[PDB]
């Protein structure tokens, strides 16, 4: 896309506000354990590594329809919505201030219930087209067939424990692409901005912040934000805050929702 | 509110100083264990998760009266107090330098008493109206009926383990809204600034700072601070610094007070 | 104070250090720079620390050159913790790692670091984890004469000024944020049981003491007040007995002459 | 090189994009355990310290051919201005169902990949210059004759002995454990590295497509690509996979690079 | 109680010079020909504080060197003289990647099946650049420490309780490599007007080392008045210590491990009063 000047005047700016609920594995809001995974299980061997249905976190994603940019398609320029900035927050951080749930507990069954703790994984992306994904896994043989709604490659190969550029996808479905085997494709995504962090280990303290005062600038080094193809804005995320440890030591992922407030402006482009 | 010019000269500025004491669960300054929760207990099962009275932390909040501005509410323009900045500190951090309290001890009963340690949760908000809340919980079935002075929703539903926008509130009462199930609503709070952090885990070192040299600017991206509706200033916080571990392993939340020094200025608005 | 112009021409520096006040504060006695052995209350009602087991603030007043009126204004300070390298020591008579074959435990655990520079005594607020704490094992301490449950929170009826070195316990006195208009203070706490100390030292960092209006602390009666505490952890003896360990703090304070209205 | 002015006008900029797969020890993409090491073994004594073939991470490196500049007093070189680089597949570490040791008496999660992290990258106009330095001068590398190591051993190599140097000229061959960047050379390369050690330490990782690293030095001059060759090198260890019985393997991840270059005039 | 006249820079050709050097670590076994070089001898532990006598070679010392700079003044009676002024330093810890090694003969994880313990625990990193020897203050965790197993160490000739705090009667200058123990000597903050020093300590038992290395960072040595260390008698003084943890042997015996540090120092000619 050859980017030209900003469009000025009335109705040249718009905002989009949304939230995305977490997709930890139990993704039905009408059922118990919503916002958690099913109980984690562990393979006996790498050739019998078959996660149960619902124990696998996936990306959250939505396409938002922007205000229509009505115009003649036969002229030498067109208009696109350009995402300038986003204010985004993890919602419900305070819910982790809870140590009376039915959990394993400290100090000879007299202390606190274990809080949700351990692995944290936080990412978000805002773009003008679906987030482009690269397949990469810790175990090429993982069998995802317990849940046919998970979108994964139809063939397995040893090389997918590294980067094999023949294994790619686009994030086009909520609650379906496992984070364990799909990551952003850094060779593409020119029209998306993504930001991610991982803090691993076993029982690691979650470290989280929340504020309504932080603006993330989405403009690139040339001053250009994501350009929304077909007036579609794509928002994606995952926010794992740790594991809930049940009385018997069984564990489930816990995720939290994410909020977004995105500012967009009209940008002229060559046609 | 349509914001017009600043009012200048003498009497155009005022400052508000206050502190808020912690609301950990034992919230009566005339009783033992003030500034701590009652002993934490642990649910036998998720459908029998009923915290005892006084074991759960709540938000601290106050509405402060500001000097009356408008004798005549039918003038074409009116004046409002605009909060410009705040200096805020957690008070009594040094009280955590104490390892001789009646606590569990290190090294086969020869070493130090355990200091207050573990989960930290710190947040404050300054606004021109009550802080707007969103309900979100780790357990939709939590039963708050041991303490009818708490403010919680009248109905429970599975979806409240994620973000359900039908479950909202406003922080209108000190020591009554549980931290564990209410968080700031990021879709509202246009007239409040809030800042929060959480560090979890079991016995995690508290990491705390105190200084009288830091000013937090409350002006938004347009140079406008919170506007105090009805000449009321709203201040809210929570500061959990960890758990006290009793000799038998029984644990209590410990909180600390927070100090605020808020600078406000007169702003003309259209009426 | 009604502040007017700076005097040009007019600057001086003050250099000092403060030794640590961990509990055994006599420089000629064994265990100097450490507390006495920590003891643990049988119950909150019986909580009476032994003499010398609790850290206190270090403080001094420096007499400045005698001078509308002219006052000394503290502009900046270079401050650093002394002797950090002394913590590189794992052969002391301590508990040790790996089945009595590995290193002695280094000094580790709780860290608490604060300093203040002002033109008058640091103003303190009382706040304690246990209102019942009995300080009568050491009558050289300065604590309130009466006890009340409300002191586990902020009760503004319980205040003092930091006028005596090695006497105000850090466990029950903190900087009063509602006062101290003429002092700058800075503090940090890292807790837990055996936490690694994380410390830095350099002679290259200047801390500006000027407030948001460009005015530093103004030295009333030509007195400059410096206060601090630097707890770097616990020494763990062979049998598990523990003692606080503290280190000295150095200060180099730049002052200038300020005219004020009288 | 006598550095003169930047070349102006159209065609004066180019970009190079690539990725490098990790070299943890099993470096064959057709075989199981690709992107991990072979099982770690432990010496019985310092004079019997002979790592098995494939248990040793090595540097990843490539030389990239740039567009030819000079068909014939001054000449033109490509100058590397900046790089955007990221570790790929961080999300693959959100996996606790692999065949691993477990938490909480075989009821809890499988251990994630955790422990030692080592991350470095280098971009230069010639091979990365290396200094030998090892924890054990007696390490015997003879189980794998494809590893590039010095021809003799000496006690002094547990510190810095400047008689023990090399250049990073082969992918998957120079062990990380005994070769580091030579800080006395590398005038024409920029390198950045970090190490977080310990036993089971949480990995702390970030990934974004928004960060540009400037490669210009204090005089405004980036790496100058001798013979129209760009050199890229890295290593990204993200921890260990802990097998059911306690057996452990290094895990590494690939790294992506997008490098911006410009034409710079220099003297013949 | 409480309590060189610098003129202009010399401009033009030959007014700048650079000094490049490295210092090898002094952990206790400081003989580059012997096994255990770059490590201490095995750590031992006192039975009591009055019997705290470290073995020879178990304690780390400062590395240091004086570098001879080009001689500037053929006539020392001139009304002004020239001195080398240290403007900046690029410094790096060398060999960080050597810590990516878990097959050495060490204690190991997971019931003798897992990795050998990497070098881990206490980290101590400091460097100093100045125009005269680093000025030292004695301060110790134990005033009674007996250093007589190694008479090549430089320590005070008498002991006193007060040395567990700051006793300013116990000072020294860092004039010998591999001889001043870091456990009892630190920079004297009341002096060192003509040296810049930077240090950090991360303690604990088995703490992860957190280390960085790059050739892209310049540390400015100029003070607040724009003046760097001035090299008295044309000598540049460089000092450091870089402890990266302990190696844990099979039986639990432990040794300090240190790494070398590299320096590239830029200096310029400065005129001074005489
Ligand atoms: C649900 C259950 O009963 N699990 C027991 C398990 O049964 C095996 C299969 O279950 C899973 C699982 O635990 O859910 C299936 C997962 O996909 C596997 N996970 C991965 C990553 O590959 C895991 C995993 O392999 C094991 O947990 C590791 O030991 O196993 C289960 O679906 C299967 O059921 C058979 C059924 O028995 C048969 O009659 C019918 O015709 O076909 C079904 C489908 O094949 O049986 C599998 C065993 O043959 O077996 C293990 C021991 O092997 C445990 O008994 C496990 O019970 C739980 O174990 C927990 C700890 O892991 C904990 O102790 C819980 O309290 C147990 O309920
Ligand atoms: C695979 C095995 O059974 N190893 C046992 C080992 O055998 C020695 C050689 O194995 C290695 C290895 O484990 O792979 C080779 C490595 O280069 C060594 N690593 C380092 C850093 O030096 C390791 C290491 O020394 C040990 O693991 C430490 O215990 O050993 C093995 O290749 C060699 O094979 C001989 C063969 O036996 C002989 O008939 C033939 O003619 O020559 C072959 C090649 O020389 O035999 C070596 C011993 O002579 O021996 C040790 C005892 O020294 C153990 O028994 C080891 O078993 C593992 O032990 C682990 C704990 O140490 C753990 O329990 C594993 O599960 C065991 O397999
Ligand atoms: C009041 C009483 O007899 N308590 C004993 C307790 O009985 C439990 C249960 O009591 C409670 C309690 O008040 O301690 C009720 C609480 O709702 C519940 N907490 C939560 C978060 O659900 C706690 C908690 O489960 C336990 O204290 C464990 O931490 O229990 C009472 O209502 C029920 O009828 O009987 C229960 C025992 O079967 O039991 C504990 C031992 O677990 C003690 O003996 C209490 O004194
Ligand atoms: C050489 C020897 O006899 N070693 C045995 C030791 O005897 C000790 C003591 O020896 C030393 C030693 O060299 O290891 C002397 C050191 O000054 C001292 N270290 C410190 C910091 O004071 C160490 C240390 O106390 C121990 O090694 C424990 O780590 O001991 C020797 O001089 C004296 O006559 O007897 C002492 C105890 O009987 O004892 C250890 C067991 O603790 C071993 O048996 C050594 O082989
Ligand atoms: C904080 C506190 O109350 N300490 C008290 C201790 C401890 O209870 C025990 O020593 C267990 O450490 O008991 C004393 O007899 C003592 O040892 O001097 C009295 C002292 O007042």
Author numbering:
A (entry chain E), B (entry chain A): 33 to 303
C (entry chain B): 33 to 41, 44 to 101, 109 to 303
D (entry chain D): 33 to 104, 108 to 303
E (entry chain C): 24 to 26, 33 to 303
From the paper:
Trichodysplasia spinulosa-associated Polyomavirus (TSPyV) was isolated from a patient suffering from trichodysplasia spinulosa, a skin disease that can appear in severely immunocompromised patients. TSPyV has a 5232-nucleotide dsDNA genome encapsulated in its non-enveloped icosahedral capsid made up of the proteins VP1, VP2 and VP3. As is typical for polyomaviruses, the TSPyV VP1 monomer adopts the iconic jelly-roll fold with a conserved core comprising two β-sheets that are formed by strands B, I, D, G and C, H, E, F, respectively. We demonstrate here that the skin-tropic TSPyV binds sialylated glycans in a binding site formed by the BC2-loop on top of the VP1 protein that is not utilized by any other structurally characterized member of the polyomavirus family.
To establish a platform for understanding the specificity of the interaction with sialic acid, we solved crystal structures of TSPyV VP1 alone and in complex with three different sialylated compounds, the branched α2,3-linked GM1 pentasaccharide and the linear glycans α2,3- and α2,6-sialyllactose (3’SL and 6’SL, respectively). TSPyV VP1 pentamers were co-crystallized in the presence of either 10 mM GM1 glycan or 10 mM 6’SL, while preformed native TSPyV VP1 pentamer crystals were derivatized by soaking them in a 10 mM 3’SL solution for complex formation. The highest occupancy was obtained for GM1 in all five binding sites of the VP1 pentamer in the asymmetric unit, and so additional glycan residues besides Neu5Ac could be built unambiguously into well-defined electron density. Nevertheless, three of the five binding sites were not considered for further structural analysis because the ligand participates in crystal contacts. In the remaining two sites of the VP1 pentamer, the Neu5Ac residue and the GalNAcβ1-3(Neu5Acα2–3)Gal trisaccharide, respectively, are well-defined by electron density and distant from crystal contacts. The N-acetyl group of Neu5Ac inserts into a shallow cavity that is built by the BC2-loop on top of a VP1 monomer, thereby forming hydrogen bonds via its NH-group towards the hydroxyl side chain of threonine 73 and via its oxygen with the backbone amino group of lysine 82. The side chain of the arginine residue 137 from the DE-loop of the counterclockwise (ccw) VP1 monomer interacts with the glycerol chain of Neu5Ac. Residue H132 of the ccw monomer forms the bottom of the shallow binding groove so that the methyl group of Neu5Ac is recognized via hydrophobic interactions by the non-polar part of the ccw H132 side and by BC2-loop residues A75 and P83. The average B-factor of the Neu5Ac ring of GM1 is in the same range as those of the neighboring protein residues, indicating that the occupancy is near 1.0 for the ligand. We found that TSPyV VP1 interacts with the GM1 glycan in solution.
